[PDB]
Amino acid sequence: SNAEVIKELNKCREENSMRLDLSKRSIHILPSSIKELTQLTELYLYSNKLQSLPAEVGCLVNLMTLALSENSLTSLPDSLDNLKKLRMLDLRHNKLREIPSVVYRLDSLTTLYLRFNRITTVEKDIKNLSKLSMLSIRENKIKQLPAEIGELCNLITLDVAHNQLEHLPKEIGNCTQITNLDLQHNELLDLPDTIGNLSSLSRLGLRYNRLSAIPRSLAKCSALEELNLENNNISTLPESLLSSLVKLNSLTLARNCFQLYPVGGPSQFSTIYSLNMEHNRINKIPFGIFSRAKVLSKLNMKDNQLTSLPLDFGTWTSMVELNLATNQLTKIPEDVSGLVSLEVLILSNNLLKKLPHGLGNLRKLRELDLEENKLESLPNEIAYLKDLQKLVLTNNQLTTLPRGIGHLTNLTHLGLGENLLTHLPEEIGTLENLEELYLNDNPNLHSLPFELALCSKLSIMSIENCPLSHLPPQIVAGGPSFIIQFLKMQGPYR
């Protein structure tokens, strides 16, 4: 209420306090009496209901911090001109349709936050704020930046994510101290060649734009720690780019137009831990490209145009997670046995009819996803996958399972739905750790084995669209809990 605000105002002037916190008090109008509190250096008014800041705030000539986020402001009074020491101005989450003209006159500012307003224009007069080291105008409606952005030579962070930019002014290259430049979720058709002038750049946000190419000069930004180009129109990378990014920890080329790996050979991948290339049109992985990729442990090639794997596929000994889903692979080579560090292998939605015996040598394999292939059998050597917890075989052409399936000590999840299974093996009962067993949509599955009752942790079982005609018809009407209870009691394992 007005009273508790006046009390805090009186308390502030009675302590001669240099900070005033009136945040989160549902204030609609701030009393004029605040003008008397001229000793304030910090004023916090965020998360209130302010539709205007009173002109009297201009009397607080010693303010260095004015925090106004999460109000309903549409402007600021010209009296803020008097705030000749203000360093930080927090205006995010208001209702600004422009930067208020007085803000362009607050040349002491080093930090200006304007996230999530409705601003359409950054006027040429932005040049007046040459002390700015942090400028965030993310989540507005800005279509263009003026060339005058280049007179902000002290910028360290510039965040213009979620705007409508089609280009960047070449004068951005005068902002030589920028380490964090976020342009993601704009409409950028290109980047200026001067981007390479930003030699201290370590974070560069470019995902979700309309880019067709990356400037060769980006290779001068050798402090980049990630390069995420997801969702653009890129199909190549410029000469020697990736090998020049000596601190690159990850690379994302997902959702682009690549048909081949970027040119430059194995040296472009010697520093990254992960490589994400999903949703392109890549038709081949070059022989030898990972020969220098000593720390690369995660490779995502999902949704490409692979019809085979390179002859040195088994040399990828440091790979831990490998996603090859939604390609056109018809076989996995025997040399898969070389991938002794592999823990996750996703092969969903390919054209696989059989699996190699070498698959059984994947001793660390924890998750194997073969959903939506054409598999007519499993090799006996799957029995040696003692670390396997999740085996997804949904939607294939399996008729029987190898008896060795019961040797999968650690298996918890077995997806067998949408197959041609005529029966489960009795060895299913040695799967002591099985929890989820999906059998739905197996139209030739007319019985279940007694030894399924031996699976003590079995808590999820689906049998929809399974005839199960050898069991009592009233039991299958009772659902899985009834079927498993029947197998226990009438079975000889109790």
Author numbering: 86 to 579
The authors write:
The MRAS–SHOC2–PP1C holophosphatase dephosphorylates RAF at serine 259, resulting in the partial displacement of 14-3-3 and RAF–RAS association. SHOC2 is a leucine-rich-repeat (LRR) domain–containing scaffold protein of uncharacterized structure that is thought to localize protein phosphatase 1 catalytic subunit (PP1C) to the membrane and possibly provide substrate selectivity to this otherwise promiscuous enzyme. SHOC2 bridges PP1C and MRAS through its concave surface and enables reciprocal interactions between all three subunits. SHOC2 exhibits the expected LRR fold; the 20 repeats of SHOC2 coil to form a solenoid with an extended β-sheet along its inner, concave surface.
We also determined the structure of the isolated LRR domain of SHOC2 (residues 80–582) at 1.9 Å resolution. The unliganded domain adopts a similar overall structure, but with a modest change in its overall curvature compared with SHOC2 in the ternary complex. This degree of flexibility is seen for many LRR proteins. In both the apo structure and ternary complex, the SHOC2 β-sheet is disrupted between strands 9 and 10, with bridging water molecules inserted into the otherwise regular hydrogen-bonding pattern between the parallel β-strands.
